[PDB]
């Protein structure tokens, strides 16, 4: 029934987060398909001004079919709206809601032997604020916006004066959306921290807490510091747009660069809020399927804490070309390099955890190993970008896009997939079919590499970010990238098939622990699914 939505139980809320995150993921992924349809070839074939003169619905379907260049007036604003929609949905309404709100709410309490979250109704509220925020973001796409069209074509980070001068009220809706999102994450963090601190089961000591619970804990702290700052940043945009302030407008004494400092002060932490829960999931998964315990438990906790705190003093590496002094450029370069040490080290610990084990190549372990390959490919590419001298060339090119899709987008996505296959049995009492999980993995892994690796070539050749159209010479690797993205999309549709199949007619789960003895955390001592009231 409706009930579901009124539940206050950490298991029910985690499930709600996972499903909603998955549907929004579907929408944002669909946006990327459309993006890749347009980037597949030079010249604009899909995003034609001519489609505006039709209705919303007829205009939609016309824009999914290619036109001859001679019949297609390039509509740059639609490109910029899609890109912004894609990025905003992913960064606020997809991966954190699924990792933190989803697996966080479900499994952190079970990991620490807590009966429920400290503030159950507050947890129900956080979900509703996420949904309200999602609604406003989606709504902004249909609201009067820039250049006398719908939607905001301003990029996920909302730089002024572009963001502050975008026509209509679409941008205001998007700001509200982000407020509601931050609120959602703030409540969630309060709840995670309080629970972690006050409600550990008798015997459960900080040094005996499972890594996933740790990763959620550290993530919750970064949220408490980072999200209020973002809320400042975006209120300042709201006041410049509606209430005559001039924080970012030079004619009133403003500096647009001020916004960047404040936004990126959130913006970096944000990328660690995304992967930390994935770090948690990868640790449990590798331990389980290597049938070994976690290598260097304590150094992992410290690495996670170090990264969490150092991620607050690196922001301006997103600003090497915004007009920072040589001294600032140099400091931030070195801070960024220091944080690269405990980050890259963790690859070694996971390999060490496999080393000497008894390795079983089941689907969750595939995702975990993929995570290790992709995280590395993304990370080394961050090394390059950290050198401001070389960032001069790469900044605002497809090389940066390749970097973050490897390290951040796919890292989170492979983490999410590892978790789902690892725990669907536990959460539902039904098991996924092994061959399909493996097939999903190979399609997704081949597809994601075809999509993003060639974007490195595009960056090197100088292809800028946020372009609806590009010079002829960028054609080849854009074409390969788009084929990879279509294959990835097929892998995901197939995955939705696999999930539908699993939940409606998957093999019945019989055991508390359907893996093995080395899946040794508390959820495996409970039934599948766990009882309504646990512990």
């Amino acid at each position: 029934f409706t009930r579901w939505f009124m539940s206050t139980n950490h298991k029910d809320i985690g499930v709600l987060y996972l499903f909603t995150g998955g549907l929004v993921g579907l929408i944002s992924v669909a946006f990327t398909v459309y993006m890749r349809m347009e980037l597949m070839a030079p010249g604009v074939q899909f995003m034609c001004a001519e489609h505006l003169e039709s209705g919303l619905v007829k205009g939609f379907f016309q824009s999914l079919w290619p036109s001859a260049v001679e019949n297609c007036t390039p509509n740059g604003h639609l490109w910029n709206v899609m890109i912004t929609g894609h990025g905003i949905l992913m960064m606020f309404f997809v991966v954190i809601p699924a990792l933190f709100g989803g697996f966080g709410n479900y499994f952190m309490p079970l990991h620490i032997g807590a009966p429920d979250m400290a503030f159950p109704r507050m947890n129900n509220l956080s979900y509703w604020l996420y949904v309200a925020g999602t609604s406003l973001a989606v709504a902004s796409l249909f609201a009067p916006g820039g250049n006398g069209q719908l939607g905001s074509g301003i990029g996920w980070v909302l730089y002024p004066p572009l963001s502050t001068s975008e026509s209509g009220y679409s941008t205001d809706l998007a700001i509200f959306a982000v407020h509601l999102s931050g609120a959602s994450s703030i409540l969630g963090a309060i709840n995670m921290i309080t629970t972690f601190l006050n409600m550990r089961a008798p015997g459960m000591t900080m040094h005996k807490v499972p890594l996933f619970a740790w990763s959620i804990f550290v993530t919750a702290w970064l949220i408490l510091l980072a999200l209020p700052v973002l809320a400042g940043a975006i209120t300042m945009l709201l006041t410049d747009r509606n209430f005559g302030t001039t924080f970012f407008q030079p004619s009133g004494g403003g500096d647009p660069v001020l916004y960047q400092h404040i936004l990126w002060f959130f913006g970096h932490p944000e990328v660690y809020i995304i992967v930390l829960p994935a770090f948690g999931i990868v640790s449990h998964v590798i331990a389980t399927f290597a049938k070994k315990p976690i290598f260097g438990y304590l150094p992992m906790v410290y690495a996670m804490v170090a990264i969490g705190v150092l991620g607050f003093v690196v922001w301006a590496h997103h600003m090497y070309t915004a007009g920072l002094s040589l001294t600032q450029q140099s400091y931030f370069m070195m801070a960024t390099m220091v944080i690269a040490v405990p980050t890259g080290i963790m690859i070694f610990s996971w390999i060490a955890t496999m080393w000497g084990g008894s390795i079983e190549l089941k689907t969750p372990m595939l995702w975990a190993l993929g995570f290790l390959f992709l995280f590395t490919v993304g990370g080394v590419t961050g090394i390059v970008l950290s050198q401001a001298s070389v960032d001069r060339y790469y900044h605002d090119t497809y090389y940066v896009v390749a970097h973050f899709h490897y390290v951040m987008s796919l890292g989170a996505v492979f983490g999410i997939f590892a978790g789902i296959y690892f725990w669907i049995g536990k959460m539902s009492g039904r098991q996924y079919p092994e061959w399909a999980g493996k097939l999903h993995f190979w399609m997704m892994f081949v597809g994601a590499n075809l999509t993003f690796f060639p974007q490195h070539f595009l960056g090197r050749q100088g292809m800028p970010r946020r372009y609806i159209d590009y010079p002829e010479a960028f054609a080849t690797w854009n074409f390969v990238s788009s084929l990879g993205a279509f294959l990835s999309f097929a892998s995901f549709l197939f995955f939705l098939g696999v999930i539908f199949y699993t939940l409606t007619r998957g093999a019945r789960v019989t055991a508390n622990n359907y893996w093995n003895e080395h899946a040794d955390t508390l959820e495996w001592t409970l039934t599948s699914p766990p009882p309504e009231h646990t512990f």
């Binding site: 074509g153 647009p256 290598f295 190549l361 590395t376 080394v380 605002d396 800028p464 960028f474 690797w477």
Partner: protein, 256 residues
């Protein structure tokens, strides 16, 4: 003039170098590429080896260790060594890049939605640069027979569409060109891959970059900070010519 600073079909490398700064970027990136390829190969081979060597079929009883002090020391120090080695080469290059020298030539560049304004204060010259194919030249940002005709007439071909502008920033070869970059409305970013330069054009701020072109030719850049509906359509063209042809160009603008 040869078209040098542009992308090439199927390219996987940098655009040709035309400045000493570009060359340093190519060198520092190639150096780090070797390192990061080694780290990637290393990590990949370890993963593949461990999965083969320690597969459940091949190794039936799992080890139980969770420590190895010497290895954890070595595997922390080595990454720290690698980064310091990089910085040791990186910082001088950055210093060479951001320390603005004395100008032989001074151009002041202003970004607008959606075109570039150039000004040579020492010569009292100024003009605007629009993409061939934009509304300004009668187009609407797409290829057509008209746009191709206009590209030929201007010394280009249909392959330079989206890169070619109606007017170019002309500069002399082997001279220190200092460019002052600002924005008039929103943020833009002025860049020429071949010179190894990029500076955001920020309203209320005047920022400086420098280059010295080492050979004559044509070099393109594209606006590199999302700036509205025609971000994809406000490129940069720089013609590097001899000292004589530069003067000739100067005199052609002189009002008598």
């Amino acid at each position: 003039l040869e078209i040098i600073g542009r992308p090439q079909p199927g390219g996987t490398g940098f655009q040709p170098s035309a400045s000493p700064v570009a060359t340093q970027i190519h060198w520092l990136d190639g150096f780090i590429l070797v390192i990061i390829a080694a780290i990637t190969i290393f990590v990949t081979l370890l993963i593949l080896y461990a999965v083969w060597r320690f597969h459940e079929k091949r190794n039936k009883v799992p080890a139980r260790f969770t420590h190895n002090s010497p290895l954890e020391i070595a595997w922390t120090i080595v990454p720290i060594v690698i980064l310091v080695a990089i910085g040791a080469f990186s910082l001088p290059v950055l210093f060479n890049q951001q320390e603005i020298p004395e100008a032989d030539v001074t151009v002041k560049v202003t970004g607008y939605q959606w075109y570039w304004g150039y000004e040579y204060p020492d010569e009292e010259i100024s003009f605007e640069s629009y993409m061939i194919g934009s509304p300004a030249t009668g187009g609407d940002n797409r290829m057509s027979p008209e746009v191709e005709q206009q590209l030929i007439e201007a010394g280009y071909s249909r392959d330079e569409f989206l890169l070619a502008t109606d007017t170019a920033m002309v500069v002399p070869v082997n001279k220190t060109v200092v460019v002052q970059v600002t924005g008039a409305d929103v943020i833009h970013s002025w860049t020429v891959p071949a010179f190894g330069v990029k500076q955001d054009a920020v309203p209320g701020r005047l920022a400086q970059l420098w280059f010295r072109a080492e050979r004559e030719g044509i070099f393109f850049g594209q606006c590199s900070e999302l700036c509205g509906i025609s971000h994809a359509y406000m490129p940069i063209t720089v013609k590097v010519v001899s000292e004589e042809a530069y003067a000739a160009w100067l005199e052609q603008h002189h009002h008598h």
